[PDB]
Design a protein around this nucleic acid. Structure first.
Ligand SMILES: [Zn+2]
Ligand SMILES: [Zn+2]
Ligand SMILES: [Zn+2]
Lengths: 101, 86, 82, 127, 137, 146
RNA sequence: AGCAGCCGCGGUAAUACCUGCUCCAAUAGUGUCUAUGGUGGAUGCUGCAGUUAAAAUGUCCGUAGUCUGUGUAUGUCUUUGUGUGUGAUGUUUGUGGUUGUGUGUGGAUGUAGUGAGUGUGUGGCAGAGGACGAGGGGCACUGGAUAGUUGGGCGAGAGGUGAAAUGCGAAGACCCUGACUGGACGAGCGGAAGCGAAGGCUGUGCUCUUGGACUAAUGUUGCGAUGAAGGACGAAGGCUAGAGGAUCGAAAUCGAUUAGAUACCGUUUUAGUUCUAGCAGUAAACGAUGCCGACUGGACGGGACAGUGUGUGUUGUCCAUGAGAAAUCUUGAGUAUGCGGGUUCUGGGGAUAGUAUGCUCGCAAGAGUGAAACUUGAAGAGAUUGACGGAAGGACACCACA
């Protein structure tokens, strides 16, 4: 099916394992599906009422980053990842750390 | 000699094979000879339980029942010796 | 364009052991230390630290490749006589 | 004779790609006797070799006329009556090609060995 | 495969040959050990019982056979009586000559478990009684 | 194509074709010979002598000044070690592993190295016995494992 | 009822069974059962196959042997076949008979290769220099989360589920706070990045050990490749002794669900999970892919060293040529059935069966080696079009919603 054989591991024997965030099953770290997100600490449909409540003259709402980790059954079921066709299976998407802002 | 039984070959075929293996382990360390620390010669033997003595220079020291040092004596003799250096 | 006559730009970008005729990369040189005028013979990829006798210094140190001649010193590649 | 078989595979590779010259980084004495028998029969243009106090080097000039060359390992021993069976196994037709032997008179192909009453060890072939 | 390596090649190729089953029965000398008639091509027997066997599906039929006793070795066997209406010439305590089927010791067609075939009945050809050339015993 | 690994590196030296005799020598030829014969008496091994000639005297090939190789020159002057330097480095490496294993028993990494280091030393000894450089009954002198 | 080596025929519409005609092949002969050569490149010297069809061994070291480094051809003579190759010859022709010539195994004696160690230092090993690495053993410290003990606050539920039940809570739970104790683990950074023979290896600082690459006018001088027999290492679970005990959890046990669930889901509670010393010897121990040597197009990268506009050792992705049964392969699964570079192992239709029995090893649990009788016409690989999914999407519709 895949030339990966399903996981990003090259030229090493073993690679460490983790426990899935939803069911808790044991999986290699290079095979798990991993996602990163930055969420506002306060909901967006609440910003107006928070501008009259604040006592400080200048306030910044905080943001946190979260890394998640799931197994193949839990990501497929939750629709985090979907079935693709034979040729579209080969397309990888990245981040580009050299972007300007 | 004997293939598997060693110093436990004085017991014939009595007592069971698990119990003759406990006799063989403790009997090897009990009847061996050890190097003295003061004179440096290989002449330390056991007198009674916990009493080891050198046949030359006659010095006496205190140890285990069947072995010259015990596994929990080594652990605390180091701690006192690291505490003085540091 | 024959393989028996390569341009001399190519002969520079060839591995030392793949060259057509046997030829290495090392040579002997002259070094002058400082105010006082001595002159020592050294090797270009020396594995020892050298020091000038007059005005006791250290005029050559070893590295992983070519030996590093001190700042206020200058070398010259030896030529043999005929 | 490990150098003779290495040379024949590198020649088959270049003759198929359309090269004009071939440079190998090794050269032995009986590898040069095999090549001198292809030159006098018309199958290569010439060659030349260098002395470097390493394993040697050699440069072959190809022609456009070679169909194939090979080496036979191990070097079996053939009497003068068994020369003709090795010919029907290795050459495509009865009019061209040359099988070479190492006899007590040098290196000869299969037509000369019959006109001198000798046998020897087989080395290779080419057509 | 060097020129002085012929003892390594005879030792190696003799061992590979044993993986052939037909060759292995001959080389180890056990080709006639478990065989109900040994080295004979035909054999005589006396008839004990007269039974009927089902065909193996997808065929509907009942093939007529007999249970016998081999006069030469005292082994029991079953044999198949070929033609149409021919099982009724034989009786019990008759003598019969049986031979092979012709397929290396396997059964043929839809007949399960039978490896032999009645040929004569009291020294008269069974195929000739069916064509009318000879008379019943 | 290394002996005990799958390494395939090609680094190393390449000496010239047809060298000559050095003109830039500062000392004499007879004053240099009496020093190559001095360092051989202090027990300096022959690969380390050639590194002093190159770096401090300007001699790149000592077969052009001494008239022959380094260990044939020292032989005529009566300096012949008891064991050659190749073989005795290997006995010494196999003794420093044997005495580390006497304190740290669970070093399975060093126990595997001791096997390979020491089968390489019995192969080099078998060569010097075919060639009559050590006796036919030589045994290595080894620390004793416990 | 019968036929049919094999594929197959016969259920009132038999070109295949039984009977009659007609025709086909060979012919004084023509069928059947059994053994054997070819058929069979389906035993493979010539001349097979081993990623997925049967098949490369979990990993290194290593002796015998093979290969490499430093046993030949031919003239003359001689000694042995009853067979056979090939001429002649009208027993009326013929199988024949008679009759000319050649050939088969060892040995003796010449000639040719044939001349000999030298010099050089190409593979390997040993030593140098400055760098690089979650390679290993030991010692000393450190970080928070889970659980628990104990001071202060609060006053009725908390937990977990598709939804609940058993079970815990007014001797004050849960939640918030000040102090402590203990075992285990080392997040984020963390990747188609590095190291180790493989199994494997991520806190910090010390220490004893280790590897491959690179750089060079250092030493030596062929000291090498492969490898039945022998040896060491080897995930997790298990077993033997001691120590330890947070979390999770086989077995046991209740509560649900169900037609029934000795199961999936949950509650109470264990062996085990950790360390030291050993035994054992197995894995989808996988790239399901022996080791060494020669040669071969492009494009975009990474990691180490050295140089200066490049090189050597390694390694990831994508395109040709070529190969393949195809899927696919790109330092090989390429270099022609145009078939020979050196040297090993394993397979020979399915099932019985990795089973019996013997032997070697183990405390055991078991491991290693390893059949037959009897049965049977397929079992299998890769791909094509359909049908189906208690499969995923995109469009739609007042026999769908709003
Ligand atoms: Zn999950
Ligand atoms: Zn004393
Ligand atoms: Zn100075």
């Amino acid at each position: 099916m895949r030339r990966n054989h399903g996981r990003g591991k090259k030229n090493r024997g073993s690679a460490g394992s983790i426990q899935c965030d939803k069911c808790g099953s044991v999986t290699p770290k290079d095979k798990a599906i991993k996602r990163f997100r930055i969420q506002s600490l306060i909901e967006q449909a609440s910003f107006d009422d928070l501008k009259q409540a604040t006592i400080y003259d200048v306030f910044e709402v905080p943001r946190m980053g979260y890394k998640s980790q799931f197994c193949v059954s839990c990501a497929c079921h939750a629709k985090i990842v979907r079935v693709r066709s034979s040729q579209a299976r080969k397309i990888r998407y990245g981040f580009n750390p050299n972007r300007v802002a | 000699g004997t293939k598997k039984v060693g110093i436990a070959g004085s017991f014939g075929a009595r007592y069971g094979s698990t119990l003759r293996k406990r006799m063989k382990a403790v009997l090897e360390t009990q009847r061996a000879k050890y190097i003295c620390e003061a004179c440096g010669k290989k002449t330390v033997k056991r007198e009674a339980v916990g009493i080891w003595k050198c046949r030359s220079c006659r010095r006496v020291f205190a140890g285990g029942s069947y072995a010259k040092t015990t596994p929990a004596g080594k652990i605390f003799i180091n701690m006192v010796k690291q505490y003085n250096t540091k | 364009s024959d393989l028996a006559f390569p341009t001399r730009e190519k002969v520079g970008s060839t591995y030392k052991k793949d060259r057509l005729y046997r030829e290495g990369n090392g040579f002997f040189m002259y070094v002058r230390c400082g105010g006082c005028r001595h002159t020592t013979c050294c090797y270009s990829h020396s594995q020892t630290n050298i020091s000038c006798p007059g005005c006791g210094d250290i005029i050559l140190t070893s590295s992983g490749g070519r030996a590093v001649v001190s700042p206020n010193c200058e070398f010259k590649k030896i030529i043999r006589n005929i | 004779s490990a150098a003779l078989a290495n040379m024949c595979k590198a020649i088959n590779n270049a003759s198929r790609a359309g090269k004009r010259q071939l440079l190998l980084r090794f050269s032995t004495e009986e590898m040069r006797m095999f090549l001198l028998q292809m030159l006098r029969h018309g199958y290569i243009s010439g060659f030349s070799y260098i002395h470097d106090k390493r394993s040697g080097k050699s440069i072959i000039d190809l022609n456009g006329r070679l169909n194939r060359c090979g080496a036979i390992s191990p070097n079996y021993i053939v009497k003068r009556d068994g020369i003709e069976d090795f010919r029907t196994r290795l050459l495509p037709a009865r009019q061209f090609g040359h099988v070479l032997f190492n006899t007590s008179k040098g290196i000869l192909d299969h037509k000369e060995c019959l006109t001198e009453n000798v046998g020897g060890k087989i080395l290779g072939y080419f057509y | 495969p060097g020129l002085f390596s012929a003892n390594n090649l005879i030792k190696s190729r003799k061992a590979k040959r044993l993986a052939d089953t037909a060759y292995r029965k001959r080389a180890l000398g056990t080709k006639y050990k478990h065989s109900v008639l040994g080295r004979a091509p035909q054999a005589k027997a006396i008839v004990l019982e007269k039974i009927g066997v089902e065909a193996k599906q997808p065929n509907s039929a009942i093939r007529k056979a007999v249970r016998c006793q081999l006069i030469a070795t005292g082994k029991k066997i079953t044999a198949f009586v070929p033609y149409d209406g021919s099982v009724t010439y034989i009786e019990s305590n008759d003598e019969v000559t049986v031979e092979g089927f012709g397929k290396k010791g396997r059964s043929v067609g839809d007949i399960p478990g039978i490896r032999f075939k009645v040929c004569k009945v009291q020294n008269v050809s069974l195929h000739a009684i069916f064509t009318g050339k000879k008379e019943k015993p | 194509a290394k002996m005990h690994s799958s390494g395939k590196g090609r680094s190393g030296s390449v000496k010239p074709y047809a060298t000559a005799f050095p003109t830039w020598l500062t000392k004499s030829v007879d004053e240099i010979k009496s020093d190559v014969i001095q360092m051989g008496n202090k027990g300096v091994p022959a690969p380390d002598i050639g590194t002093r000639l190159r770096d401090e005297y300007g001699i790149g090939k000592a077969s052009d000044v001494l008239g022959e190789s380094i260990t044939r020159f020292l032989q005529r002057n009566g300096v012949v070690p008891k064991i050659p330097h190749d073989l005795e480095s290997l006995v010494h490496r196999a003794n420093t592993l044997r005495s580390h294993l006497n304190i740290y028993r669970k070093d399975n990494s060093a126990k595997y190295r001791l096997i390979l280091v020491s089968s390489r030393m019995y192969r080099v000894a078998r060569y010097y016995k075919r060639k009559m450089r050590i006796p036919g009954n030589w045994k290595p002198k080894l620390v004793e494992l416990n």
